[PDB]
Ligand binder design. Structure first.
Ligand SMILES: NC(=O)C1=CN([C@@H]2O[C@H](COP(=O)(O)OP(=O)(O)OC[C@H]3O[C@@H](n4cnc5c(N)ncnc54)[C@H](O)[C@@H]3O)[C@@H](O)[C@H]2O)C=CC1
Length: 223
């Protein structure tokens, strides 16, 4: 069973007041991440190819470059697990975080694609989540969900040993056009969104409501 709280030790940078400095420094940072993260380099190289094929079909927000595009495509890939893990356990040993550029770009991609729009999404897991009554909740790590409750429940993401999150998000972004899917109608939620209303139903259902955007514990850490 995993703990569901405010994610106090999760790298949650929102980059307030430093996107310009990051867009300039992130390119070098990505290289540094690569030199010490083979899996990421490979994951990224593959995502870049897919991105090239996706890019022509639609137009993107002003400032949405290939880094943003590639990062988002990669996330819907297999690099997602190790990346969320690295973010979730950041405070532990913050010296071994080789997703400095990656985190920024994915974070920026969602902000550039973000609107005021709120959605009703669902997320399934095969690992039981226990709300530890902090008062509110944040996923910490980026979290993917689906507009389809049926998808979140499919044997692909959920099981009796797990949990089904019923979430109302307002920072979440519809990334169908980016995923390798795109039938899972995925909505990517930043780990820094705060749910002021938490409710547990039965042993495997958790409702997250009253989404709000509050400051993060980290800000422009690598700017
Ligand atoms: N889960 C869903 O309902 C949906 C998933 N997807 C896609 O499926 C693929 C996999 O997504 P996920 O299953 O969400 O993988 P994910 O990266 O969230 O899974 C991370 C894993 O690490 C562990 N973990 C997660 N949070 C933790 C925490 N707070 N504390 C301790 N351990 C934790 C668990 O084993 C968890 O399954 C991605 O491409 C995702 O976008 C798309 C639509 C819906």
């Amino acid at each position: 069973p995993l703990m569901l709280d405010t994610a106090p030790n999760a790298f949650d940078d929102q980059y307030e007041g430093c996107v310009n400095k990051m867009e300039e420094k992130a390119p070098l940072l990505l290289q540094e991440d690569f030199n010490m993260n083979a899996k990421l380099k490979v994951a990224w190289e593959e995502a870049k190819k897919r991105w090239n094929n996706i890019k022509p079909s639609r137009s993107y927000p002003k400032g949405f470059n290939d880094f943003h595009g590639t990062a988002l495509v990669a996330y819907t890939g297999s690099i997602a697990v190790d990346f969320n893990r690295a973010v979730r356990e950041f405070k532990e040993n913050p010296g071994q975080f080789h997703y400095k550029a990656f985190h920024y770009y994915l974070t920026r991609a969602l902000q550039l694609l973000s609107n005021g729009d709120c959605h009703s999404v669902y997320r399934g897991t095969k690992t039981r989540f226990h709300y530890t009554g902090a008062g509110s909740v944040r996923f910490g790590q980026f979290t993917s969900s689906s507009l389809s409750k049926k998808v979140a429940q499919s044997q692909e993401f959920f099981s009796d040993h797990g949990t089904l999150f019923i979430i109302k998000t307002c920072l979440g972004v519809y990334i169908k056009e980016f995923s390798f899917r795109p039938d899972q109608e995925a909505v990517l939620i930043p780990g820094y969104e705060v749910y002021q209303k938490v409710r547990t139903q039965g042993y495997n259902e958790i409702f997250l409501d009253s989404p709000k955007r509050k400051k993060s514990n980290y800000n422009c850490l690598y700017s």
